[PDB]
């Protein structure tokens, strides 16, 4: 039978008999990670004689 | 006559530098259009709110 209309936004959809629900449980989750490391070491020695 | 003139130099340099720069962000949304969710939850590092 079906033909109970389900509206998501303006669009009314006909739910299949097999489907208990399809529903717009809309959600989102953005994860950003930025780890920068620098190291420098810089050694000089100038032994000199006359 | 006798003469003797003796010179030494011994320069040394040692430089070290370290940076750590850690940035973390987790925008989370429920509700609203999937496109507005993904547009808003995308972290803009110059305007993180
Ligand atoms: C060790 O010797 C080098 C070579 O002379 C030095 O490098 C010179 O340094 C002077 C002063 O900064 C500069 O005007 C020259 O152009 C440099 N020469 C070269 C080839 O780079 C260096 O500074 C000395 N190190 C220490 C710790 O005294």
Swiss-Prot record, chain A:
Glycans are attached at residue 46. Coiled coil: none annotated. It is found in: Secreted; Target cell membrane. N-glycosylated; contains one or two bound glycans. Not O-glycosylated. Heterotrimer of 3 chains: alpha (C8A), beta (C8B) and gamma (C8G); the alpha and gamma chains are disulfide bonded. Component of the membrane attack complex (MAC), composed of complement C5b, C6, C7, C8A, C8B, C8G and multiple copies of the pore-forming subunit C9. Component of the membrane attack complex (MAC), a multiprotein complex activated by the complement cascade, which inserts into a target cell membrane and forms a pore, leading to target cell membrane rupture and cell lysis. The MAC is initiated by proteolytic cleavage of C5 into complement C5b in response to the classical, alternative, lectin and GZMK complement pathways. The complement pathways consist in a cascade of proteins that leads to phagocytosis and breakdown of pathogens and signaling that strengthens the adaptive immune system. It is linked to Complement component 8 deficiency, 2: A rare defect of the complement classical pathway associated with susceptibility to severe recurrent infections, predominantly by Neisseria gonorrhoeae or Neisseria meningitidis. Belongs to the complement C6/C7/C8/C9 family. This is Complement component C8 beta chain.
Swiss-Prot record, chain B:
C-, N- and O-glycosylated. O-glycosylated with core 1 or possibly core 8 glycans. It is found in: Secreted; Target cell membrane. Monomer or dimer; as a C5b-7 complex it can also form multimeric rosettes. Component of the membrane attack complex (MAC), composed of complement C5b, C6, C7, C8A, C8B, C8G and multiple copies of the pore-forming subunit C9. It is linked to Complement component 7 deficiency: A rare defect of the complement classical pathway associated with susceptibility to severe recurrent infections, predominantly by Neisseria gonorrhoeae or Neisseria meningitidis. Component of the membrane attack complex (MAC), a multiprotein complex activated by the complement cascade, which inserts into a target cell membrane and forms a pore, leading to target cell membrane rupture and cell lysis. The MAC is initiated by proteolytic cleavage of C5 into complement C5b in response to the classical, alternative, lectin and GZMK complement pathways. The complement pathways consist in a cascade of proteins that leads to phagocytosis and breakdown of pathogens and signaling that strengthens the adaptive immune system. C7 serves as a membrane anchor. Belongs to the complement C6/C7/C8/C9 family. This is Complement component C7. It comes from Homo sapiens. The chain holds residues 349 to 397 of 843 of the full protein.
């Amino acid at each position: 039978g079906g033909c109970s209309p389900h509206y998501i936004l303006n669009t009314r959809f006909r739910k299949p008999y097999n489907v208990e629900s399809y529903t717009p449980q809309t959600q989102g989750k953005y994860e950003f990670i930025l780890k920068e490391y620098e190291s420098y070491s810089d050694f000089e020695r100038n032994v000199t004689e006359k | 006559s006798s003469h003797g003139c003796k010179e030494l130099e011994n320069a040394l340099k040692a430089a070290s530098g370290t940076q750590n720069n850690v940035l973390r962000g987790e925008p989370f949304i429920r509700g609203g259009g999937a496109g507005f969710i993904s547009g808003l939850s995308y972290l803009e590092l110059d305007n993180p709110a």
